[PDB]
Symmetry: D2
Subunit: 115 residues, 4 copies
């Protein structure tokens, strides 16, 4: 599990459950190729997106469908989605956690990169 | 104006207006002595808390009354307040902006510290 | 000035100066068309990106070039940029401030949306 | 485990390891009584602070010694510590996670409250 996504809800103080997450890899021609996707669990986590063999160095985009999340809760949001764009580097540690903390007009995101 | 406080609401995407703020300074006996207080304006800003003369070196606590803010809007929040505790003016006078971004179960705070 | 961008540095406690910002607007064919660009000033603010006339309804992407910022300061950061994607002016003209707070492996962004 | 503390480092993109954390309970006379304390683990977590029987309703303060953390890494910080002050309410869900994301001149904190 080299890539994990964790999503929290700052309005309810809870994991953000059943949020759609799409990961893309940047192709040679600067387009975004679908790579992996899923929905966050009851604990706000999405595991099993990729494998060590598939997750090569490159630029990746993690798109979190925040707009749909907020609308399903009956709350009016600002963003279309949250985007996290980063380079995977084999020099760095091997496990990437992308965390995001959501509010209707704001979000925070951090990377936890460990061995 | 060497100490300013700015507060935003992350639910509304607006300034957080009418937020009460209490500033304390640690006394010689290591208790928290009341130093200044005020409330944020329509722009979410609180100016005029103190003066260059009065804002001496010390350890200061800026308490932002987030629970009262949210309750006044009919919301039950998690935190009692947001506390920002820092040493000021240890290398000479500086200007401090304490910014805070509020959600019902979360907040962020940052400091912008300028000149010398 | 209907679109403004403000960027802070959470490591230094200062405005993030000379941050490049590129704004795109989604075209009829659903590609991202370049709309405006600029860089933050000494105050960490970017004004004058667009005009009320030009800033029509649409889906906009504000790309803040955080990697170039950090690399220019001799730091290797995590993200390529911070992207802020939103629908604008769907209920008539509004003024948008996009704020971002930067750390080498993290950022926060919020929107302040005002009048009608 | 009704109370857990998790601390992350936004400069290095890592858990915040060996951070001192002190929890206090507000007494009848408005003073802060020591309640529990510890140091975060290699995963930036502090488990086992209290038990269900001990963690009664009331106002609690979680003090995270951010200044010492940053100084041990050779980095100059702004805050003396980070403080998180909240009421424990038996009406709400039963497990509290206090999370904090640290930078030298900023921090974020959120509560994840679940059953
Ligand atoms: N100093 C002003 C501009 C300015 C606007 C805002 I609005 C602000 O407030 C926040 C609050 C949070 I919370 C953030 O995450 C961020 I980014 C900015 C700050 I500080 C400065 C000038 O004179 O130009
Ligand atoms: O298991 C976990 C529990 C909580 C967290 C919190 C992450 C987090 C991310 C942010 O961008 C801001 C913040 O205040 C917190 C991460 C992992």
């Amino acid at each position: 599990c080299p890539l994990m996504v964790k999503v929290l809800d700052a309005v309810r103080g809870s994991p953000a459950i059943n949020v759609a997450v799409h990961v893309f890899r940047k192709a040679a021609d600067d387009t975004w190729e679908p790579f992996a996707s899923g929905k966050t669990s009851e604990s706000g986590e999405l595991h099993g997106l990729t494998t060590e063999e598939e997750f090569v160095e490159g630029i990746y985009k993690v798109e979190i469908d925040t707009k749909s999340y907020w609308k399903a809760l009956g709350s009016s949001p600002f963003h279309e989605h949250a985007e996290v764009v980063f380079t995977a580097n084999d020099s760095g540690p091997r496990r990437y956690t992308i965390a995001a903390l959501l509010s209707p007009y704001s979000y925070s995101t951090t990377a936890v990169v460990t061995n």
